[PDB]
Design an enzyme around this catalytic site. Structure first.
Site, mmCIF file in Angstrom:
data_model
loop_
_atom_site.group_PDB
_atom_site.id
_atom_site.type_symbol
_atom_site.label_atom_id
_atom_site.label_comp_id
_atom_site.label_asym_id
_atom_site.label_seq_id
_atom_site.Cartn_x
_atom_site.Cartn_y
_atom_site.Cartn_z
ATOM 1 N N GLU A 80 0.820 -1.201 0.024
ATOM 2 C CA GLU A 80 0.001 -0.011 0.067
ATOM 3 C C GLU A 80 0.796 1.259 -0.019
ATOM 4 O OE1 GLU A 80 -3.364 0.552 -0.470
ATOM 5 O OE2 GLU A 80 -4.091 -1.368 -0.114
ATOM 6 N N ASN B 165 -7.249 9.577 -5.641
ATOM 7 C CA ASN B 165 -8.130 8.679 -6.434
ATOM 8 C C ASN B 165 -8.883 9.544 -7.538
ATOM 9 O OD1 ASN B 165 -8.487 7.068 -3.280
ATOM 10 N ND2 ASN B 165 -7.282 6.315 -4.897
ATOM 11 N N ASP C 28 -12.151 9.440 -7.851
ATOM 12 C CA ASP C 28 -13.254 9.963 -7.310
ATOM 13 C C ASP C 28 -13.191 11.205 -6.184
ATOM 14 O OD1 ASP C 28 -12.405 9.114 -5.003
ATOM 15 O OD2 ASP C 28 -14.151 7.697 -4.448
ATOM 16 N N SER D 150 -11.163 11.411 -3.831
ATOM 17 C CA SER D 150 -10.959 10.828 -2.558
ATOM 18 C C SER D 150 -9.158 10.712 -2.589
ATOM 19 C CB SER D 150 -11.627 9.401 -2.000
ATOM 20 O OG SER D 150 -11.060 8.582 -2.606
ATOM 21 N N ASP E 141 -5.860 8.294 -0.509
ATOM 22 C CA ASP E 141 -5.825 7.270 0.332
ATOM 23 C C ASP E 141 -4.260 8.069 1.179
ATOM 24 O OD1 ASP E 141 -7.220 5.582 -0.746
ATOM 25 O OD2 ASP E 141 -5.824 4.994 -2.165
ATOM 26 N N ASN F 47 -8.613 5.574 3.239
ATOM 27 C CA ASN F 47 -9.286 6.185 2.131
ATOM 28 C C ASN F 47 -10.411 7.348 2.521
ATOM 29 O OD1 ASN F 47 -11.849 6.506 0.089
ATOM 30 N ND2 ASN F 47 -9.695 6.546 -1.087
HETATM 31 CO CO LIG Z 1 -6.370 2.415 -2.372
#
Ligand SMILES: [Co+2]
Ligand SMILES: [Cl-]
Ligand SMILES: [Cl-]
Ligand SMILES: [Cl-]
Ligand SMILES: [Cl-]
Length: 129
Positions: A35, A46, A48, A50, A52, A59
């Protein structure tokens, strides 16, 4: 902070992840590797809108508030900035909430894609826990 493998393993164990909700420590170490590359400061935007955040790439659409994710929730009740500490406590505490949300570690696609199905115990091999 950029953790070493065993360093992170020890810290996660101290914060109560070893066998949390049935997931052995190696799962968490492997997830963090893929990750964030063990990086507490990692962030990734992201499609959308958002983002992380942190060692476990938590998120903002569901779990933390960054004040820049329209329509989002804050189910860990924390600002996303708290997840960019060198101390992993906030991330661990939020991860515990995520994993208990009833889909196990499937929330981390990097875990499902790159850790699940492998011998994850190898990730803590040689660590003196
Ligand atoms: Co992610
Ligand atoms: Cl924030
Ligand atoms: Cl820590
Ligand atoms: Cl916390
Ligand atoms: Cl393990």
């Amino acid at each position: 902070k950029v953790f070493g493998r065993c360093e992170l393993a020890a810290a996660m164990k101290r914060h109560g992840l070893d066998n949390y909700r049935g997931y052995s420590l190696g799962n968490w170490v492997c997830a963090a590797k893929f990750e964030s590359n063990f990086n507490t400061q990692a962030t990734n935007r992201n499609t959308d809108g958002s983002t992380d955040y942190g060692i476990l790439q938590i998120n903002s659409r569901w779990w933390c508030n960054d004040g820049r994710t329209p329509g989002s929730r804050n189910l860990c009740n924390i600002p996303c900035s708290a997840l960019l500490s060198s101390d992993i406590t906030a991330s661990v505490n939020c991860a515990k909430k995520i994993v208990s949300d009833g889909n196990g570690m499937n929330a981390w696609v990097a875990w499902r894609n790159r850790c699940k199905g492998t011998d994850v115990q190898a990730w803590i091999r040689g660590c003196r826990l």
